[PDB]
Amino acid sequence: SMLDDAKARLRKYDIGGKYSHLPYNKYSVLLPLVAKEGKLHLLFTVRSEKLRRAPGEVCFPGGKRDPTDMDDAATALREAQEEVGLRPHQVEVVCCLVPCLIDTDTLITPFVGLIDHNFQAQPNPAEVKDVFLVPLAYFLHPQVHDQINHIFEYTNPEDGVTYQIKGMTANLAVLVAFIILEKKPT
Ligand SMILES: O=C(Cc1cccc(O)c1)Nc1cccnc1
């Protein structure tokens, strides 16, 4: 099946807890996979204008680890719940992908999660301005604009709204697309 095939692919890239105890400032993100219309999608947030860091940017749900978190996956799930109402029974964490080093003192750990088909996002407007899906296959043939660094522009065909996706968020989306979609029979 599509979902069993995706999970099987993802597990081959799982680094697990290998880098998780290193003494960094620690953040986790959830890369949330949603199956709709017979295809996989990633769920993204647009950060609120209220926020201090990166107002109005597209990013995955996530945030800073706190003392309550049993592990880095827990960070991702707690933050996703706060941001978009995703409850833990609604997500299966499949793997931990390569962490992202930034600012010399920070390590961001990405987890891929399969999202239940009955989840409906409840954007928390103190943190999130918008929530939207992009088909995973888009990231194989993105619409690129150079700002010099590469920016993806995705237009939602449901409503014509264009979102800009860039940086770590864009990079991780392409990684997941490669992992899941490469070398597949039609
Ligand atoms: O803050 C995060 C996680 C994160 C950590 C590092 C980098 C990044 O792009 C994203 N996610 C969030 C926060 C508020 C609203 N929507 C998404």
UniProtKB/Swiss-Prot annotation:
Source superkingdom: Eukaryota
Inhibition and activation profile: Inhibited by fluoride.
Compartments where found: Peroxisome
Tissue specificity as recorded in UniProt: Expressed in liver, kidney, pancreas, pituitary, small intestine, spleen, heart and placenta. Weakly expressed in brain.
Entry annotated with the keyword Hydrolase: yes
Cofactor(s), by name: Mn(2+); Mg(2+)
Chain positions of site Important for coenzyme A binding: R53
Molecular-function annotations in GO: coenzyme A diphosphatase activity; magnesium ion binding; manganese ion binding; snoRNA binding
Main subcellular location of this protein, as a coarse class: other
EC class of the enzyme, as a word: hydrolase
Annotated ranges, domain Nudix hydrolase: 24-149
EC nos: 3.6.1.-, 3.6.1.77
Short sequence motif Nudix box: positions: 64-85
Family: Belongs to the Nudix hydrolase family. PCD1 subfamily.
Subunit structure: Monomer.
Name of the protein in question: Peroxisomal coenzyme A diphosphatase NUDT7
Residue span relative to the full protein: 14 to 209 of 238
